[PDB]
Amino acid sequence: NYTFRCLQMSSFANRSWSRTDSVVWLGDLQTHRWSNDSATISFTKPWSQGKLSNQQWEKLQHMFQVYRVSFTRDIQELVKMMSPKEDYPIEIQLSAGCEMYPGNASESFLHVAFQGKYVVRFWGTSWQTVPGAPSWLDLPIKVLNADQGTSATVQMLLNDTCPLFVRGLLEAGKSDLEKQEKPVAWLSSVPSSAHGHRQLVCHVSGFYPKPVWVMWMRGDQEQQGTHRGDFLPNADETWYLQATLDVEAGEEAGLACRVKHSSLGGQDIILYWGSLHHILDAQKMVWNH
């Protein structure tokens, strides 16, 4: 079902300059925010503290605060150590969290990327380089794997704290999590590349949660030339998708954009091409190009 992600973006320009911004996602809803200039992690939901007590949370925050500055300096040193092997600028990405399951079952992970390539994970008890990782990493890993304190803290964040803290969120956010926002669909078109051909675009916007079916139709028959675009975010935590079909000019009459979604009950959104509403909405859209 759900996946918890703590996301860390660390950027090092030279010896003097660096910053670490973090974001936190349960499923596809952002739960936390940690800007470099803030000393404290900020909730982005009312229910962000999950089920943890004020001091339970503080324990966690204070641990993370220490980690941040500690990690910064540690990287800086790792550079000093890899004297010509690697050099600023350096970009580091962390992805750490949980996969939740039925149970009281749960799987945990901590992945590190370096310059945008996945290189190092944590696994069981130690740090490990992954297949295809640059072989010069072998040393720093050894140097870091000597720190049994860091290892035991990480083991606790991954094995216990994470699956605990997120079960906490799943309750505290249940309402927000399972919410239905109804999609809102509108047709348009542009001229296709090919002469005497048109491209018809069916806009779907404002839906939640993510699964959505969008197809162009001639009656019951699904038009196979339908191309779904990528899921694009709205800022109000809803989604936008568009499906474009390509056809000969004049072939549009009788075509319809069928939408299926969990928010709609059994009632599929069917937009026929030259509909009473298409005609009118398109009129509200005219522009000078």
Epitope: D74, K80, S83, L144, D147, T150
Partner: T-cell receptor, first 113, second 114 residues
């Protein structure tokens, strides 16, 4: 600094037990360790403490550390005339070789016959 | 199993003179340090290193430079000796896989005559 040792000078009778104190603020506090320095010489390692509440003992020396309290004590049992050299509390801030050492200003011991 | 040694034990220097002090180590230690002991202050790092010819500034690097010719060896240079200067210079080496594995030498005592 971030490591305060007390008192600045101790005086004890030979054969007596002497107690040396060290408080800190260094963070994280991976480990604390004690050093003996004879006049005009190097730093000799006495004992190394790691755990949240740790006790270690080498030879005469016995040392305890409370992390919660950010405090450490060094005991010398049956002090001898040798024990004259100054004593240095040092906190390390990483369990990796990346981490370094934060030095206390030291305590002179003066063993009277 | 072996020793870390600083030469010379004692050193006579004059105002504004350039001063060097070697430190050798056969522990196979990759990290090597140069501290300064000031009466009533405790050790302050001047220069460290992770091997030849890595040299990295510590909190007291101003007024000195250092050079690591080889694993076994680490030299510090005092650029301009102070007028009445008196200081002890201590050298330490360390394992990269054991934060703790740090061993010190027997110190170097500098007197600036005048």
């Amino acid at each position: 600094t971030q490591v305060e040792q007390s008192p600045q000078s101790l005086v004890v009778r030979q054969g007596e037990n002497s107690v040396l104190q060290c408080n800190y603020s260094v963070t994280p506090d991976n480990h604390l360790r004690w050093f003996k320095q004879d006049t005009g010489k190097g730093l000799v390692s006495l004992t190394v403490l790691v755990d949240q509440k740790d006790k270690t003992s080498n030879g005469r020396y016995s040392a305890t550390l409370d992390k919660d309290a950010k405090h450490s004590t060094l005991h010398i049992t049956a002090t001898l005339l040798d024990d004259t050299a100054t004593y240095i509390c040092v906190v390390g801030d990483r369990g990796s070789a990346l981490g370094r050492l934060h030095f206390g200003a030291g305590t002179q011991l003066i063993v009277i016959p | 199993g072996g020793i870390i040694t600083q030469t010379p034990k004692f050193l006579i220097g004059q105002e504004g003179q350039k001063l060097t002090l070697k430190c050798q180590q056969n522990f196979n230690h990759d990290t090597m340090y140069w501290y300064r002991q000031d009466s009533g202050k405790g050790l302050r790092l001047i220069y460290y290193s992770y091997g030849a010819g890595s040299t990295e500034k510590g909190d007291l690097s101003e007024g000195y430079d250092a050079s690591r010719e080889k694993k076994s060896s680490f030299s510090l240079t005092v650029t301009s000796a102070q007028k009445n200067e008196m200081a002890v210079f201590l050298c330490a080496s360390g394992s990269l896989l054991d934060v703790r594995e740090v061993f010190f030498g027997k110190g170097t005592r500098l007197t600036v005559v005048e």
